[PDB]
Amino acid sequence: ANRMILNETAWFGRGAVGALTDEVKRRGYQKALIVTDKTLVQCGVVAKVTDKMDAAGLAWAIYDGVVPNPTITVVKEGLGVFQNSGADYLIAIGGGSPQDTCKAIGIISNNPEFADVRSLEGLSPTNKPSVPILAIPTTAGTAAEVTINYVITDEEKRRKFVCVDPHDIPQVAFIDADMMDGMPPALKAATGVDALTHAIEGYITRGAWALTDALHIKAIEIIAGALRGSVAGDKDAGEEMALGQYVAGMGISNVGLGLVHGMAHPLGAFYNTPHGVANAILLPHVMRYNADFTGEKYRDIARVMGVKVEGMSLEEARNAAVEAVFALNRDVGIPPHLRDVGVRKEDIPALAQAALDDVCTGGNPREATLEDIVELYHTAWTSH
């Protein structure tokens, strides 16, 4: 049988964060710790929520120390602020980095033996649910609000590790494009192709089944239809992206991903490469590698990305799907090569071993070898 874990409650649309004060009152919570980053404070995104909490008389404290690719140090620091805050629940405001930090803090607070953080890797053997989390994404996005995963950087071991735990699922997600509009265009582009990567990898993952296929192919259609417009500042395209990125995540931890996420993680660990950019650059190269092991599915991807697939051979349809992703990447300004974002050719074998061992790689529809992954990093790296 197949398990699906989802948010019990989610609010969607512009103004969805307007539901937060009523949700808090209905659940009887007394005081939030907001887990966020300095950019979202500076840009006034956090205040979109705290102004509503202030108006409703709801108490809050803030931890804004999160950094991209959040580290063991960031988790321990946030946990310290949580323990001293008197908060009884968490509000995660931000992209995957704050949402994942918030999950780690919530889990460790109710499972204090995991305070070393390393011990959470894999199927975390936690006995207690997380401190309740209300999740408010500000990128479009990682869908960290709806997965049971969170990804922490071990700086000493130079690796990103995935923690998988039904105990971390947020109680309520608020998916509000008003919270996302202020992303710089390059951040809309990269988080949007990360969303597309979740949807494509989820569509073709070894564990795929009927329900996740239906969700993923709809997410691909929405994201491919909306991302150019959203990057360009179209308000309705932004609302479409907010929905598409969420639907794209409804399979990440229910069925799995593949070698794109497997190869993106070591770039985050080695260089602090932004997750979205890493996935975007890799995606079409990994799609080419996987193409002949994905049945009819690239014909479906090409069709919903606007390709006229009528009369194409399966290989022509596969080539068209890959080309549609290369074209979208160019069209929203994704750097074309890993050399452009400071990846070092001499690191490729170490990156490839880290990718081969990444849990995401296990879902890949083509069984990857070390040599295959080395060649893929070279293909993605090269100016030629």
- Single out the residue of 145, 176, 194, 300 in contact with Fe ion (rule: CB under 5 A): 194
Measured CA to CA, the distance from residue 220 to residue 332 in angstroms comes to 16
- Is the distance from CB of 90 to CB of 82 less than 8 angstroms? yes
User: Phi and psi for 143 in degrees, rounded to 5?
Assistant: 55, 25
Does 71 interact with ligand NAD (rule: CB under 6 A)?
A: no
The footprint of Fe ion on residues 13-72 (CB under 5 A) is none
Binding mask 248-277 for ligand NAD (x = CB under 6 A): ----x----------------------xx-
Which residues lie closer than 8 Å to 138 by C-beta, 6 or more apart? 40, 45, 93, 94, 95, 179, 180, 182, 183
In terms of CB distance, is 168 or 194 closer to Fe ion?
194
CB closer to a copy of itself, 5 vs 53? 5
Q: How many residues bind Fe ion (CB under 5 A)?
A: 1
Provide, rounded to whole angstroms, the least separation between the CB of residue 90 and Fe ion: 21
The answer to whether residue 223 forms part of the interface with a copy of itself (CB under 8 A) is no
- Which residues inside 102-121 make contact with ligand NAD, applying CB under 6 A? none
Report the chain's terminal Cα–Cα distance, integer Å: 46
Annotate 150-194 with DSSP letters as a single string. Answer: EEEEETTTTEEEEEE-GGG--SEEEE-GGGTTTS-HHHHHHHHHH
182 binds ligand NAD (CB under 6 A): yes
Cβ-based nearer residue to Fe ion, 178 or 194: 194
Q: Considering only 11-19, 185-193, 262-270, 349-357, which stretch makes contact with a copy of itself by CB under 8 A?
A: 11-19
Residues 147-166 that bind ligand NAD (CB under 6 A): 147, 149-151
Residue (of 91, 170, 71) closest to 138 by Cα position: 91
- Does residue 183 have a known ligand-binding role? yes
The whole-angstrom separation of Cα 248 and Cα 223 is: 9
Residue ranges at the known binding site for Fe cation: 194, 198, 261, 275
